[PDB]
Design a protein around this nucleic acid. Structure first.
Lengths: 93, 280, 241, 93, 280, 241
DNA sequence: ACTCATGATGCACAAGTGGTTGCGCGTG
DNA sequence: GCAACCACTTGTGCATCATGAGTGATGA
């Protein structure tokens, strides 16, 4: 089962405790768990509608040269496609 | 709308795609911020309940009510595996909204011919080297007990461990001998796993075939198939390996989880529950 | 032929030797374990391990419920881990003749939308609590089939038109604009469930449907620890404050 | 290749930038990367001897029935095995 | 000890286990906090250098001395892929300590018979059906030239695009035709990848067999094997699929990367380089 | 037959029309592209894309070095894309006869430990920079083989007992407890290297070892921006401030 | 008696900002 | 000129505590 990582901050405590039912929490806001496509997709959909006004970022295995892809929802660090290679972009104030 | 704490069956991993069991003792299971948190004295552990089929409760586990509500919603079954056997079971709503398995099991148990056929199939699974085309229920039970005791004797001479000519049963099986504790721990782990699988599949745990009388009869009927194949040899190996000062329960549970993973006991259990009920 | 239904809430159950201990804000209630029957552990309950050990040692059906059994959350083994109701129900539902007979027996026995929906859900919870206490399977239903709780639906159909409808109409009459109706409907339904007569009716109907002989039938006594202390003092229930 | 996740805080900026060469950074202190076993062990050895006085937690795929394992060094959320199963333990004051 | 910014060859992935390339334009590659950072106007992007084999630098690109040192130590090669082909190359110390490959390549390039035989192997890998066991240098070179023209013509006819009878050559090849820009992008990516692999393996880019005279002769020789197999058809597909007002270079590079991944061009390239030197 | 090896440090390089624009703190310099033979880019340098394109169009070797070429970090193509040196080296190293002849020519022409090692490392860096500028392969070594940087060791052994040893001895003599000996050794080595005579001798020894005819040899010109302003002004190098 | 939501109050850590020191990474 | 180091401020959001509000997750 491909690995899935979700990072949260500035989100309601309900979601912060809810994700611990599916994946563990190695450190504050970051959650790691092994699922399949369906479970990971459903859990990302759940995170989408419970994060509210927060920041969420997901990392999971993909079919690129690096081997992973990112999904972010209103997150500070967006992802920019460098010709099929996903990289993290940090905008400057 | 997604609400924290309530999830559909699809958002949850399938029965065969999750872990086996967790043993909790001297703790306080609780739900804070919609997380099943085990409030041990030193600190708190949050359980990934969606990845675990059954949750074992040892001595001193003060479990709240919303914790049980959350565990039942998740699909993680609860079993109070105290000293000397399993003391109590608990289960929420089934992970399956369809009762094809349940109605088929009811049809098979309401008929004497189907009951004897299912008992024959169970015996063939436990011992495939015999011919059971003309056996009866009482004969099946007697033979089952006879070679269960024979397997116990074989494993007792194999690992050089004393055994007081007994067969394990969850009712009143106690002793200071480490073999007793190892057998108890391995067997309660197996029974909790079987109970969780049966509850998740929608099957009624009281519609047993070999065992009748108590509402956990089917749990026994499914656990005895793998009792002598894995859990009993694992307990005997634990008793042989355990040294002075070793927690027999902890090491026995570790070894039985290792054997459950190695033997693929839970996927095998689902396949068996499908084959016995005869769904094409 | 007695089956007491002790409903616990807002308490912490621990075990003194052969006696559970319900410690509410009113005080500490000590009950002999041999008389528990069915325990309906409500919200705000911290059930201990020794307590469930003692309760399961005496065939006590622990059912985790909500406000007076509005919702069903989990259950343990049945009354004296009995299978007679379960086996009888399975035998009667499998073959067509007895299933049709039981369906005919059920038929013979038998804002606003939100109020009805909440009342139906509360009735489903109470019916599921009673069923899981007795030992029946919620899936083996006669009129309804194919679902995990088809039997729960079928049993609640008896009380659809005489419990949920009056409560829903009362809520609709008492409803205020800008207020959630399901909340009021659930609160009124649990208020109706407070007395316990409805639970007695459900137990009697469940035992009547399966053609259980009247001699072997057991009756329901929905005890209340503090409201019915006179009926409990001579039975061995110590009270403390 | 298994996905390795390393979380850092209270570590020198040198390590924070250095570990980005191998494996990306999706959040403050949260890193994700795909390595084989040997590369992951070498990177963890680098993390151990560079963070000085700080917190380091690494999560990698393993062969238990959860699907992952944790190895942490001087981290707040220690890992406790629940009979062969890794769980996150958060000590209280 | 371990120092931030430095890493031994063992701490680095194998050459065939890395990503192919990344393109950077109108930016400022920089090293801050020991990380290769690409300081765009609107933000900053940190390059996972240890997983990328070669780095492509476009127009309006500033790179710092420490950034070049860091990329070279990490093993990533630097190629200045401006307009009109590759403008410059750059690389650091190789991550392959042993020089067996380089010594074998030198021995193979000093002997005229060895040069002719290795050129035969390259022509065989580029075109396996034909037999060239009795060809000389001029006969070979003219024959690959004719085959490349034929492949260009047939691929142009396949995708129905105008081709003005040209062949790519990084020696002053410029054009504003969208097909020309797409094929130039694919080819500069290919040459950068070849340079990265050759530098990583320890081979000298100046010891060529078919091409000779310039310091990158071996790079052209190795890229001959793969320029007509994948890069040209993918470039033609990009030109055919291009729409009005589209960045041809970005989509051409994306499709080139997709073709490199699908064709396993990196493991194939290292295997072909190993077989060319007859290393068992 | 003339090659100018201009070393750039603490400056930015950009192109305006055909001449690179050094933007050091002292002032702005406008060396034409054709004037530069090899650009030894040093620490604190932001080489631009336009400057790289212009330098590569005119066959300039960009070598990223340390302070005065003590360390070699990365390099581009050779001087005017020359492979004749590399081809001759490969031919002379392949067979045993030429290898032995060149090695014999090598020997014919050929705290304290910490300083010696640092000086050897700096000498290796300078040799590698010169070799990468000329186009030779560091792997193809005569005395040393089996390492990716063997030829660098062989060439540095020419100067091992003539440059590194006196510098290391001077550093050891002028040292105290608690001082980083490697730092002093590297600083003194770059102080020795700034003169440029060592680099000219190194290039000449490279061609001599390669058995290149004296007619075809190239003489090195270690030019400087402001130290040799009077020499650079007549060749079209603008100076600003 | 539980759990959640919430308004405080305290706080630990990352972020930018201002000079300062050094050009570094050290076997054949 | 580039980049690391360090010191100093600014500030974001996690974690805690005390109080009031609920018993909730809503299908023939």
């Amino acid at each position: 089962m491909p690995m899935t990582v979700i990072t949260l901050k500035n989100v309601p405590q309900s979601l912060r405790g809810d994700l611990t039912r599916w994946m563990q929490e190695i450190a504050t806001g970051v959650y790691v768990g092994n699922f399949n496509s369906r479970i990971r997709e459903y859990l990302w959909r759940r995170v989408q509608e419970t994060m509210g006004a927060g920041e969420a970022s997901m990392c999971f295995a993909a079919r690129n040269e690096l081997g992973y892809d990112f999904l972010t929802e209103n997150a500070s660090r967006s992802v920019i496609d460098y010709d099929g290679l996903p990289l993290i972009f940090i905008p400057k104030e | 709308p997604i609400i924290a704490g309530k999830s559909e069956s699809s958002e949850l991993p399938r029965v065969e795609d999750r872990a086996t069991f967790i043993y909790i003792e001297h703790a306080k299971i609780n739900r804070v911020d919609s997380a099943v948190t085990v409030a041990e004295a030193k600190g708190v552990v949050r359980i990934p309940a969606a990845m675990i089929g059954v949750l074992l409760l040892g001595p001193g586990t003060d479990i709240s009510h919303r914790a049980v509500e959350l565990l039942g919603d998740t699909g993680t079954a609860l079993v109070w595996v105290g000293e000397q056997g399993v003391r109590y079971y608990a289960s929420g709503r089934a992970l399956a909204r369809s009762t094809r398995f349940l109605v088929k099991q009811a049809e098979l148990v309401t008929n004497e011919r189907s009951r004897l056929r299912v008992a024959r199939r169970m015996y063939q699974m436990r011992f495939p080297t015999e011919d059971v085309s003309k056996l009866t229920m009482q004969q099946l039970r007697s033979h089952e007990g006879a070679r269960v005791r024979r397997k116990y004797r074989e494993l007792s001479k194999k690992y050089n461990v004393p055994w007081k000519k007994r067969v394990y049963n969850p009712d009143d099986f106690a002793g200071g001998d480490p073999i007793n504790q190892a057998l108890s721990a391995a067997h309660v782990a197996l029974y909790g796993l079987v109970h969780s699988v049966v509850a998740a599949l929608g099957l009624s745990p009281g519609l047993g075939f070999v065992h009748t009388g108590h509402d956990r009869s089917f749990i026994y009927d499914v656990a005895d198939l793998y009792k002598a194949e894995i859990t009993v040899p694992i307990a005997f190996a634990v008793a042989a390996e355990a040294e002075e000062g070793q927690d027999i329960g902890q090491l026995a549970r570790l070894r039985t989880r290792d054997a459950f993973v190695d033997g693929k006991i839970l996927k095998r259990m689902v396949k068996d529950l499908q084959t016995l009920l005869e769904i094409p």
